[PDB]
Amino acid sequence: MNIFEMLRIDEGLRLKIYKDTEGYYTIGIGHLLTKSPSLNAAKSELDKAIGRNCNGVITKDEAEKLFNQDVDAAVRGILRNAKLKPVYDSLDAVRRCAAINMVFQMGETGVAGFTNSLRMLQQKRWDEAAVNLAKSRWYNQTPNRAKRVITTFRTGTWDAYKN
Ligand SMILES: Fc1cccc(I)c1
Numbered sequence: 001m002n003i004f005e006m007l008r009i010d011e012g013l014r015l016k017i018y019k020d021t022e023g024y025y026t027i028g029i030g031h032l033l034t035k036s037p038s039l040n041a042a043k044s045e046l047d048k049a050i051g052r053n054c055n056g057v058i059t060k061d062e063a064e065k066l067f068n069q070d071v072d073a074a075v076r077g078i079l080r081n082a083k084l085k086p087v088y089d090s091l092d093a094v095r096r097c098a099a100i101n102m103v104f105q106m107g108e109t110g111v112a113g114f115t116n117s118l119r120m121l122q123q124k125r126w127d128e129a130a131v132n133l134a135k136s137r138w139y140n141q142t143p144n145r146a147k148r149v150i151t152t153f154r155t156g157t158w159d160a161y162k163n
Contacts, residue, residue, distance in 0.1 A: 001158040003071055003097040007104055009161055010145050013063060017042055017056040021142055027056075028063035030104070031070055074103040081108055087118045095121070098152040105145075106138060121153065130154040 011030030017039070020026040025033045025042035031049070033042040039056075046054050050062055058066075078084045078099065088099055102111055111118075114136070120129035130150045133139065139146040151160035 001094075001097075001161055003100050004067070006097050006152075006158075006161055007067070007071065007101060010101065010105075010148070013060070015058055015060065015063060017046065027058060027066075029067040029070075031063075031066045070104065071100065074100050077108050078103055083115075083118070084108065084111070087122045090122045090124075092156055094156050094158065095153055098149050101149050101152075102138075105142075110138075126154045126156075 008029055013029050014027065017025055017027050017033065020030070020032065024035050025039065025045075027033060027046060033045040033049075036042070043054070043056050046056065046058070049066060050058060078088050084099075084103075088096060091099060102114075114133070117129055117132045120132055130153060133150050133153065134146065136146070139150070148160040152158070
């Protein structure tokens with residue numbers, strides 16, 4: 001298991017524009033297109049992202065390319081963020097995947113409220129961090145995915161994704 005397999009499990013693969021769990025236009029392996037209610041705005045974002053007139057539909061190769069770019073962008077954002085980088089660098093490789101997963105789903109601004117969780121993770125207080133991570137809108141709105149990510153932080157194993 002690696003970050004790509006982990007997020008592919010959590011996000012699925014759809015080749016036509018769909019709506020994510022928040023109702024926002026998305027495509028591929030969880031690639032957010034826009035928060036605008038305009039499908040035309042989403043289609044414009046898609047064409048810009050792919051470099052051709054897509055009509056709201058992409059190929060698997062294109063979905064995987066966007067996915068690679070999105071994972072890399074999450075990593076580079078963590079590494080540029082003075083609050084996130086020290087915690088990320090303190091983690092083992094499996095838990096780093098859980099960190100990328102959260103940033104992929106909610107962005108750097110979505111994780112800004114997790115300061116206390118981040119401190120517990122840096123302190124390697126895994127059970128306490130897991131309890132704290134679940135006290136969140138994130139956990140309440142996507143509990144099965146949050147449970148998998150939290151189990152990954154709690155245990156440092158892939159058990160939630162093998163199961
Ligand atoms: F960017 C980061 C670093 C550590 C933990 C999380 I959640 C995000």
